């Protein structure tokens, strides 16, 4: 039993994390009270990867909820599945972080991180064989971005031989709360480059476009954006939660997806995305899965090359037809797959589809086009930093300009590193 410890920090992290547990709980047949009411043993075969079992055949998510404000965590505890989380696993402060990376990372966050690690330690100790951690957070705020990366650095120090995986929401001016989001995101990306093995880059710019253009949502809300994130998170974790052969744990996924230690930022994709009773053929799932309009990172895959790709098909379908369509996508578009990593595309199939869909497909690509996302953030960062705009919010917390210069240089390096392998 290879357990995973889940961590969600900040407003975004806790609202997306809550929806995630609501989704996979339904898939595994766990109700809001922790009782299982499923009709298939496939639901429980790997339930231990994300759930602890308590007395009375109760399943408790191995999840830790963290925030410097009590607000969003009070909503979670009042939400649909709020009663399913372990009460001791709610760790929150009162001051907040004010969308300030320095506050989450150096001042307000430092005061609260030890109590979070105490809960992480309690969960890890009761793990037969802990395999790693998964963190949900945004990079544009203060708690998830600043304190989230602080948590990751301290978790690595105490568990250096475990895998660290994150779902990181990238900021976008299209869906922005404050102007300092490029600062917070740039500072966090360098932390992620060093202290995570796998990061799913969830771009709020892409989530909005998908809701506006495809789903035909005139006024997308955060709830709408999070509906896409729940579906994607459920998809990318399918191979971890159900019996399978490919990418069945966090370490084997890293070995298949990360040829170079720093290039571990993935583009997730989902299909279908319907504005809904029509069956979707395997060819349709495959073409939509690879369509940029189904990408969650807001990067054009045809602007780069795929280093590695992981595809997951869910539902009852012809595995022979899945192989034919997957081989058709690669053989027809072979120029977009680097030739120095043979057979870099791996496919998995799970019989249990997500709720409300007869069939689905989740895309996980390590494409050099992801540099477009980091470039975008780098440009916005520089636009303000060249004039030192809004820096006083951070120097007032002890930070020096040099740390901004270094974070800027580090991310430009990451952009250059992607560009070198694209040629």
């Amino acid at each position: 039993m290879r357990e995973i410890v889940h961590i969600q920090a900040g407003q975004c992290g806790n609202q997306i994390g809550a929806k995630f547990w609501e989704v996979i709980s339904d898939e595994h047949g766990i109700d809001p009270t922790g009782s299982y009411h499923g009709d298939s043993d496939l639901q429980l075969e790997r339930i231990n990867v994300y759930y602890n079992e308590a007395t009375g055949n109760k399943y408790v998510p191995r999840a830790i909820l963290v925030d410097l404000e009590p607000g969003t965590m009070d909503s979670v505890r009042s939400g649909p599945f709020g009663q399913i989380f372990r009460p001791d696993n709610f760790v929150f402060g009162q001051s907040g972080a004010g969308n300030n990376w320095a506050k989450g990372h150096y001042t307000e966050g430092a005061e609260l991180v030890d109590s979070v690690l105490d809960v992480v330690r309690k969960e890890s100790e009761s793990c037969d064989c802990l395999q790693g951690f998964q963190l949900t957070h945004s990079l544009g705020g203060g708690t998830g971005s600043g304190m989230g990366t602080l948590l990751i650095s301290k978790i690595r120090e105490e568990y250096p031989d475990r895998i660290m995986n994150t779902f990181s929401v990238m900021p976008s001016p299209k869906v922005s709360d404050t102007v300092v989001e490029p600062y917070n995101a740039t500072l966090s990306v360098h932390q992620l480059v060093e202290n995570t093995d796998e990061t799913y880059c969830i771009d709020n710019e892409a989530l909005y476009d998908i809701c506006f253009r495809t789903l035909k949502l005139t006024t997308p809300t955060y709830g709408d954006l999070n509906h896409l994130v729940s579906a994607t998170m459920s998809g990318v974790t399918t191979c971890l939660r159900f019996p399978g052969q490919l990418n069945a744990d966090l370490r084997k996924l890293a070995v298949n997806m990360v040829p170079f230690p720093r290039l571990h930022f993935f583009m997730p994709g989902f299909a279908p995305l319907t504005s809904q009773y029509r069956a979707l053929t395997v060819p349709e799932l495959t073409q939509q899965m690879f369509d940029s309009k189904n990408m969650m990172a807001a990067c054009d895959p045809r602007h780069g090359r795929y280093l590695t790709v992981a595809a997951i098909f869910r539902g009852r379908m012809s595995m022979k037809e899945v192989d034919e369509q997957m081989l058709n996508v690669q053989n027809k578009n072979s120029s977009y797959f680097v030739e120095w990593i043979p057979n870099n595309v791996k496919t998995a199939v799970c019989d249990i589809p997500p709720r409300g869909l007869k069939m689905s497909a989740t895309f996980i690509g390590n494409s050099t086009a992801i540099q477009e996302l980091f470039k975008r953030i780098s440009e916005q960062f520089t636009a303000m930093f060249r004039r030192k705009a809004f820096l006083h919010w951070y120097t007032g917390e002890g930070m020096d300009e040099m740390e901004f210069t270094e974070a800027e240089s580090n991310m430009n390096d990451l952009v250059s590193e992607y560009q070198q392998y694209q040629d």
Binding site: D323, L327, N328, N331, K332, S334, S335, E339, P342
Partner: protein, 338 residues
Amino acid sequence: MYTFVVRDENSSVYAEVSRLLLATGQWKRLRKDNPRFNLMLGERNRLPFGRLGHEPGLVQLVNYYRGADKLCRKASLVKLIKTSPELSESCTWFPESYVIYPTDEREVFLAAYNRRREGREGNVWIAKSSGILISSEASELLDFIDVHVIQKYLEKPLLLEPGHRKFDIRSWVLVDHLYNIYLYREGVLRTSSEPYNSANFQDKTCHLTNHCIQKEYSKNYGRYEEGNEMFFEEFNQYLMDALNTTLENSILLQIKHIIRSCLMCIEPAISTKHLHYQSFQLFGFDFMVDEELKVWLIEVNGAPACAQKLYAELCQGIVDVAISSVFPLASIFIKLHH
């Protein structure tokens, strides 16, 4: 959308085939080292046959038969004809040849050389390999070698008139993945502009019919025919006027016989019938015609060029019977049955 790769930029035949495949809108060219290809216009040397047929979901075809070198190398051809029972040792359409190393056939070559000299027969032999020498003294030939082949130089060649000149016949044969033997309806005679002189063998301009040697060492290049190339329409008319016979009866039957014999002999060794990849190949047979209207096989080229006027028709035929047969889209050959 079929995919193909190009690995022999020096191939004039397949540079045109490539151009045609693209002109169909249904074929896409990939980088030379991309493995996800349907067709490989491979290189002439060390073609990695062992890496073909291992791509899931891709029917792969290559434009060369692995092992066809046995027929397209002079030393190999001699060994193949002598040892193969199907060709026996007494096959009447191949000049008596011996393989000499600078196993070896030195002693055997001199044995038959003496029998003819004693009998007063012509002992004019020619030495060549994969620069040649034509002499009537076996000692001079062996000194020249110091792998090479020594075969009887045909002393009584059929001479085209006017000119009293030598020539050779080139036939293009296409073998597809099913091992159907297709002889191109169009051939070419590569003629010598200089009159044949059996007295001085050192002046090899009239003795060698090579298109390159004629244009470089001959003064009468292009006097009778454009580029020292006489096509079958004219050659047939000549045979009808001068010899009262046709190209089909006097020469073509023997050519088809020789083509079938050579290709059928190696079919078990090179056939891709039940193989994980399929092969086809365009061959270039070269024949000599003696004054008795008997056809002799000179050699077989595995990577031949085509006559300028015939690139279009032939290259299209390659796409039709060899490539489109395996990858259909949305006769100029004579099928030699067997």
